[PDB]
Amino acid sequence: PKKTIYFGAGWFTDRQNKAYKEAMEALKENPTIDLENSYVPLDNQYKGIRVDEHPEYLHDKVWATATYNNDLNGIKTNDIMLGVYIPDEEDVGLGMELGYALSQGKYVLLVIPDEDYGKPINLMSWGVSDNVIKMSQLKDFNFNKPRFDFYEGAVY
Amino acid sequence: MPKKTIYFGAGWFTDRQNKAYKEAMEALKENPTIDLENSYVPLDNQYKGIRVDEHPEYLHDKVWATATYNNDLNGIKTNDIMLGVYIPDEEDVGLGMELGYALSQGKYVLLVIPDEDYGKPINLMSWGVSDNVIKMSQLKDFNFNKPRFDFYEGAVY
Amino acid sequence: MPKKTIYFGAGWFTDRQNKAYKEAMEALKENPTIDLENSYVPLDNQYKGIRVDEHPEYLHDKVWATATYNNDLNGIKTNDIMLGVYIPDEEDVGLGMELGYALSQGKYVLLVIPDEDYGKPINLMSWGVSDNVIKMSQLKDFNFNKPRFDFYEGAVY
Amino acid sequence: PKKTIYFGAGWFTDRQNKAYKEAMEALKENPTIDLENSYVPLDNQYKGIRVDEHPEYLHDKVWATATYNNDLNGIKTNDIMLGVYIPDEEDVGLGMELGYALSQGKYVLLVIPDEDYGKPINLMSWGVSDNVIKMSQLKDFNFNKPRFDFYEGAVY
Amino acid sequence: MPKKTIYFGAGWFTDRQNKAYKEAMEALKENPTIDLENSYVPLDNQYKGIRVDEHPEYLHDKVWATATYNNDLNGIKTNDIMLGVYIPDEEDVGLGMELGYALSQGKYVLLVIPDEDYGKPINLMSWGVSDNVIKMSQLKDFNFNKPRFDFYEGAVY
Amino acid sequence: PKKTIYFGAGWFTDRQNKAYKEAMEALKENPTIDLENSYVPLDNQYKGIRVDEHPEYLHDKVWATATYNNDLNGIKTNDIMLGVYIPDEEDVGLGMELGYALSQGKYVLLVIPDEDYGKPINLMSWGVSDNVIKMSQLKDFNFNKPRFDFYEGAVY
């Protein structure tokens, strides 16, 4: 039995992009996940338009509405909310997604790189989370039996 | 005559944040549609009146975190409007979450950006949860009895 | 003394609808439990004040649709009661949706049927979302501070 | 992997009944759907009583409560909300179901007959929808990867 | 000046329950933050004014059950605070459900325990749904305009 | 196709413990249920601590928070809410869980021992329920096609 996820992860910095690649490698190796039918944002850009190459779309409200809608739709139609979370580079966008996931009754799992696990995270991030784990535990996490636990680290 | 209460969503972690905080609070004091005395201000409602900047021993205390987290949620759900003091270059993951929770509890979500920054690009998901976004100089006068959807007059990254 | 605000759910697409609209609005003006000045009337809150009956160029405009749709939702969620002016022979898919959304946001859903039609069969799902349904002549006097569940005195098809 | 649906469709008119038969034929041929475990209203009439043959049940409040409850239960316990939507014969009942589906966090898909696709639909119908498609696209729609898109047609 | 309305969650099935009921109602009469006249009291809002203790013929009536059940839900969702008069040795499955429903509709959930019993262990899930729990002698004076999360000063079994 | 459940059942009395064992035997024999990936509270005690043997944990707020959270998490991440319901020993805890299940859009099924089916149940328990059945019908209940029905018994 496999569960699908929403791949909540930033792609703006070096530490973010590192964590992204690690978490995606982890999922490819996790037998409880259906990655092919999961919602990965970067593979679901509206009408395939790459906003790096056409920044004129940052002032287009239809572009924004669809992208925003598609990402929410990604969360609500999948089983688990995954949040790749960097403590020194905390993301207001991911913050919002975690709130939305809560409201749609999803398990919220945060994944922190092991080099950073233990470091202080925002109180509300701590709170929305059902659990938070090290990146090394993601390859083996049992998504069929997901459970509540506390972060073993600081919170501000 | 009719007054609404708010939840004062705002960071206090940087200089620009602290500045925005002071400005927005002065704004509300002067707004005749707001009951500020019965509004929820987080910093006045941390568990046992203690903040972890001033008492770092509480960084690892799970009782303090549980109650503070719960009280902040309780603040959002029992007040009429969700207010988010928002700095575009210093966006807060905490406030991000609060905006989502406010959405789920059916509150008007209003962002307030300092005038010096209004127009600057904001995160897509912040744009989206928002019902409306205004300059800090509009906050003294905003009519909270007739709150409306509008699009931000600025970019989104 | 205590007053509630409403969302004025009503079609404007037919003659009977437009008649019902005018009657219900006069009713609310005279109801002492309602604050009509701070209530949400859709027709006064379309995006950019423009309606697509009067400006058909907006039929294919997605910005206009997004904002109007959002503002109507915002109208429901930030007011106390969901009011649905309901014609049984001219039932509105738009109002149908609004009734569902109001349910999800925990509002009292009140239907008002013109007296000439009260008793006529209404759609099952409209019956079901409703907390209560009344004749137009009851609307001037309805006590919105003590709203109650009751069954429609009529059929359902 | 198969998803289940709620078959939201009127049966009161000729155009409605045509659309019904087409959409059901479409689903029978769609490999991403489990139709056997989907909720089809007309196959789930309370205590098998046919209201055509016994209209005395239209004044029975217990009959109405159960039917109304069963239909909502149909929406909440299935994966996708399907709405067969005729633009010239818009249904207040379907309208309500779409709102309920939104509130229960389901993908809302509308299906319009191709002869009608493009014609004006109500604004709120447009809004609740995650996507709207032509009847001919239903046989092949991928329900494992459902996405946000705008109707390519008018709205009042 | 600002007043909130409540839903009077309380059993009436035992002597201790009936005692607690009378005490809590006297408390609210004297609380200046409450509008009791516009609050929802279940016992005054059963379908057709009839209670099944006094008319056991209604034990098997599904119309009576549907409307009463609906009206009780409607009571919770259209009032500001969820109040639960709670006896630890006589815990009520009905009130248990109401507390959950109140949570889902985003209401402050306040439990009131008789002073003679405050401190006694309460069910885990009751503890958890609750925002706060107080002694009956605190109820006359509780400020419902500034309701806060707090932990019960007692055990949980 | 199998659905998972949350095993809502008391363990404090003789009648409760009897009903528990019967309902669990029933599920083991039901082909529509995945019991291995269901949430059974007693197998999910926080950090394996047995509160019978260490009652000092009844005054620990972290223990309570995690247990309470894990049980809610159990309800929200499974498909069906099962409530083993004894009419003479009605549980305020189960009451709350049923409300939560409703709010998360789950089918709520109550199971009453046959020796008790028919006996009066609380109005609000009746109301939250989508259906209520005899313990003997649980071995064969079709959880892929769950439907609305009324309790055939009294309510106070």
Q: Please choose, from the candidates D146, D149, D23, the residue with its C-alpha nearest in 3D space to the C-alpha of residue D80.
A: D146
Is chain F in touch with chain D: ≥3 Cβ pairs within 8 A? yes
- E143 Ramachandran zone, left/alpha/beta (phi>0; psi -120 to 50): beta
> What are the C-alpha distances in Å from F118 to residues C112, D83, F18, F112, F132?
40, 39, 18, 9, 10
Q: How far is D140 from chain F (nearest CA, A)?
A: 22
In this structure, are residues A143 and A30 in contact, taking their beta carbons and an 8 Å threshold?
A: yes
d(CA F77, CA F71): 10
Cβ contact B74–E151 (<8 Å):
no
Record the tokens describing residue E29, joined without a space.
């009469």
User: Which of E35, E38, E78 minimises the CB distance to C108?
Assistant: E78
d(CA F81, CA F83): 6
> Which chain F positions have a beta carbon within 8 Å of D44's beta carbon?
147
Cβ contact E94–F124 (<8 Å):
yes
Collapse the DSSP code of C81 into the 3-class scheme (helix H, G, I; strand E, B; otherwise coil) and give the result: strand
Give the chain D residue whose CA is nearest to the CA of A68: D148
The CA-based angle B9-B100-D69, given to 5 degrees, is 135
Is chain C in touch with chain B: ≥3 Cβ pairs within 8 A? yes
> Which chain E positions have a beta carbon within 8 Å of C107's beta carbon?
77-78
Collapse the DSSP code of D15 into the 3-class scheme (helix H, G, I; strand E, B; otherwise coil) and give the result: helix
Q: What is the dihedral of CA D21, D26, D29, D34, to 10 degrees?
A: -90
Record the tokens describing residue E130, joined without a space.
């609750």
Q: Please choose, from the candidates A110, A65, A66, the residue with its C-alpha nearest in 3D space to the C-alpha of residue B93.
A: A110
Sheet holding F131-134, edge to edge: F5-8, F80-84, F107-112, F131-134
Q: What is the dihedral of CA C136, C140, C141, C143, to 10 degrees?
A: 90
In this structure, are residues E39 and E7 in contact, taking their beta carbons and an 8 Å threshold?
A: yes
In this structure, are residues D148 and D35 in contact, taking their beta carbons and an 8 Å threshold?
A: no
Query: Which residues make beta-bridge pairs with E83?
Result: E8, E110
Which run of H or E residues covers position A5? strand A5-8
Is chain E in touch with chain D: ≥3 Cβ pairs within 8 A? yes
Record the tokens describing residue D54, joined without a space.
């016994």
Establish how many alpha carbons lie within 13 A of residue A72's alpha carbon, considering only the half-sphere containing its beta carbon. 26
d(CA B14, CA A63): 32
> Which chain A positions have a beta carbon within 8 Å of C66's beta carbon?
61-62, 65
What backbone phi and psi angles, to 5 degrees, belong to F33?
-115, 135
A-F Cβ pairs (cutoff 8 Å, strict): 27
> What are the C-alpha distances in Å from F151 to residues E50, E86, F148?
21, 27, 10
> Which chain A positions have a beta carbon within 8 Å of D148's beta carbon?
46, 66, 69-70, 73
Give the chain B residue whose CA is nearest to the CA of C101: B106
Cβ contact D148–A66 (<8 Å):
yes
In this structure, are residues E139 and E24 in contact, taking their beta carbons and an 8 Å threshold?
A: yes
Give the chain D residue whose CA is nearest to the CA of E70: D65
Give the chains touching F; criterion: ≥3 Cβ pairs < 8 Å: A, B, D, E
d(CA D69, CA D63): 10
Exposed/middle/buried for D21, CB within 10 Å: 0-12, 13-18, 19+? exposed
- E119 Ramachandran zone, left/alpha/beta (phi>0; psi -120 to 50): left
Alpha helices by DSSP H, chain D: 14-28, 61-76, 92-103, 123-128
Is chain E in touch with chain B: ≥3 Cβ pairs within 8 A? yes
Q: How far is F155 from chain A (nearest CA, A)?
A: 31
> Which chain E positions have a beta carbon within 8 Å of C145's beta carbon?
38
Record the tokens describing residue D34, joined without a space.
């489990």
Collapse the DSSP code of A137 into the 3-class scheme (helix H, G, I; strand E, B; otherwise coil) and give the result: helix
d(CA C73, CA C70): 5
Cβ contact D92–C126 (<8 Å):
yes
User: Which of E62, E65, E128 minimises the CB distance to F68?
Assistant: E128
Record the tokens describing residue C117, joined without a space.
């039609």
> Which chain E positions have a beta carbon within 8 Å of D62's beta carbon?
62-63, 66
The 3 state secondary structure assigned to E46-57 is CHHHCCCCCCHH
What is the end-to-end Cα distance of chain C in Å, rounded?
40
d(CA B132, CA C74): 11
Which residues of A fall below an 8 Å CB-CB distance to F? 1, 105-107, 130, 144-150
Give the chains touching C; criterion: ≥3 Cβ pairs < 8 Å: A, B, D, E
> Which chain A positions have a beta carbon within 8 Å of F43's beta carbon?
none
CATH number at residue B10: 3.40.50.450
Record the tokens describing residue F153, joined without a space.
């018994």
Q: Which residues contact E7 (CB under 8 A, 6 or more apart)?
A: E39, E40, E42, E75, E76, E79, E81, E82, E83, E98, E102, E107
DSSP-derived letter for residue A148 is -
d(CA E156, CA E126): 9
In this structure, are residues A3 and A116 in contact, taking their beta carbons and an 8 Å threshold?
A: no
In this structure, are residues F119 and F88 in contact, taking their beta carbons and an 8 Å threshold?
A: yes
Q: How far is D73 from chain F (nearest CA, A)?
A: 7
Query: Which residues make beta-bridge pairs with C81?
Result: C6, C108
Is chain B in touch with chain D: ≥3 Cβ pairs within 8 A? no
Exposed/middle/buried for C29, CB within 10 Å: 0-12, 13-18, 19+? exposed
The CA-based angle E106-E92-E81, given to 5 degrees, is 25
Residues of F assigned a catalytic role: 97
> Which chain A positions have a beta carbon within 8 Å of B92's beta carbon?
90, 92, 95, 122
d(CA E23, CA B20): 47
Method underlying the structure:
X-ray
Residues of E assigned a catalytic role: 98
> What are the C-alpha distances in Å from A27 to residues A38, B16, C144?
11, 39, 54
Cβ contact A69–D1 (<8 Å):
no
Cβ contact A73–D1 (<8 Å):
no
- In the numeric block, the tokens 């919602």 are attached to A39
Range of the domain at C94: 2-157
d(CA A1, CA A7): 19
Q: Please choose, from the candidates C2, F102, B74, the residue with its C-alpha nearest in 3D space to the C-alpha of residue E101.
A: F102
What backbone phi and psi angles, to 5 degrees, belong to B34?
-115, 135
Record the tokens describing residue B52, joined without a space.
């972890």
Sheet holding D5-8, edge to edge: D5-8, D80-84, D107-112, D131-134
- In the numeric block, the tokens 């299940």 are attached to F101
In this structure, are residues A2 and A32 in contact, taking their beta carbons and an 8 Å threshold?
A: yes
- In the numeric block, the tokens 């009130």 are attached to E95
Cβ contact F66–A149 (<8 Å):
yes
User: Which of A37, A73, A105 minimises the CB distance to D148?
Assistant: A73
Per the structure, the count of domains in chain A is 1
d(CA F13, CA E157): 14
DSSP-derived letter for residue A77 is T
In this structure, are residues E74 and E106 in contact, taking their beta carbons and an 8 Å threshold?
A: no
Q: How far is C128 from chain D (nearest CA, A)?
A: 6
Q: How far is E143 from chain B (nearest CA, A)?
A: 10
**Choice among B23, B26, B90, B98 that is catalytic:** B98
Record the tokens describing residue F130, joined without a space.
């989508």
Query: Which residues make beta-bridge pairs with F81?
Result: F6, F108
In this structure, are residues C126 and C111 in contact, taking their beta carbons and an 8 Å threshold?
A: yes
Question: In F126-156, which positions are buried (b, 16+ CB within 10 angstroms) versus exposed (e)?
Answer: bbbbbbbbebeebeebebbbbbbbbbebbbb
> Which chain B positions have a beta carbon within 8 Å of A59's beta carbon?
155
Give the chain A residue whose CA is nearest to the CA of C66: A65
What backbone phi and psi angles, to 5 degrees, belong to D115?
-60, -20
Cβ contact A97–B125 (<8 Å):
yes
The full DSSP string for chain F is --B-EEEE---SSHHHHHHHHHHHHHHHT-TTB--TTSB-GGG--GGG--TTT-GGGGG-HHHHHHHHHHHHHHHHTSSEEEEE--TTS--HHHHHHHHHHHHTT-EEEEEE-TTTTTS-B-HHHHHH-SEEEEGGGGGG--TTS------SS-B-
What is the end-to-end Cα distance of chain D in Å, rounded?
38
The full DSSP string for B54-97 is T-GGGGG-HHHHHHHHHHHHHHHHTSSEEEEE--TTS--HHHHH
Query: Which residues make beta-bridge pairs with C113?
Result: C135
Q: How many residues does chain C have?
A: 157
Q: Please choose, from the candidates F73, D130, D101, F8, the residue with its C-alpha nearest in 3D space to the C-alpha of residue A106.
A: F73
In this structure, are residues F86 and F15 in contact, taking their beta carbons and an 8 Å threshold?
A: yes
Q: How far is B144 from chain C (nearest CA, A)?
A: 10
Exposed/middle/buried for B23, CB within 10 Å: 0-12, 13-18, 19+? middle
Most A-contacting residue of C58, C60, C61, C62 (CB-CB within 10 A), to test interface: C62
> What are the C-alpha distances in Å from A149 to residues E128, F51, F56, F142?
16, 18, 20, 33
- In the numeric block, the tokens 């189960």 are attached to F94
Active-site residue flag, C98: yes
Which residues of B fall below an 8 Å CB-CB distance to C? 2, 80, 106-108, 131, 145-151
In this structure, are residues F153 and F117 in contact, taking their beta carbons and an 8 Å threshold?
A: yes
What is the longest distance spanned by two Cα atoms in chain C? 45
In this structure, are residues D85 and D7 in contact, taking their beta carbons and an 8 Å threshold?
A: no
What backbone phi and psi angles, to 5 degrees, belong to C129?
-65, -35
Percentages of chain E per state (helix, strand, coil), in multiples of 5:
45, 15, 40
Q: How far is B150 from chain C (nearest CA, A)?
A: 7
Compute the radius of gyration of chain E from its Cα atoms: 15
Cβ atoms within 10 Å, residue B107: 24
DSSP-derived letter for residue A16 is H
Cβ contact E155–F58 (<8 Å):
yes
Compute the radius of gyration of chain C from its Cα atoms: 15
Give the chains touching B; criterion: ≥3 Cβ pairs < 8 Å: A, C, E, F
Q: Which amino acid is at F54?
A: H
> Which chain C positions have a beta carbon within 8 Å of D156's beta carbon?
13, 52-53, 59
In this structure, are residues B86 and B111 in contact, taking their beta carbons and an 8 Å threshold?
A: yes
The full DSSP string for E34-103 is B-GGGSB-GGGSSGGG--TTT-GGGGG-HHHHHHHHHHHHHHHHTSSEEEEE--TTS--HHHHHHHHHHH
Cβ atoms within 10 Å, residue A21: 10
Helix C93-104 to helix C62-77 angle (10° resolution) is: 50
Give the chain C residue whose CA is nearest to the CA of B104: C105
d(CA F125, CA E72): 13
Question: In B53-67, which positions are buried (b, 16+ CB within 10 angstroms) versus exposed (e)?
Answer: eeeeebeebbebbbb
Record the tokens describing residue F26, joined without a space.
């029933």
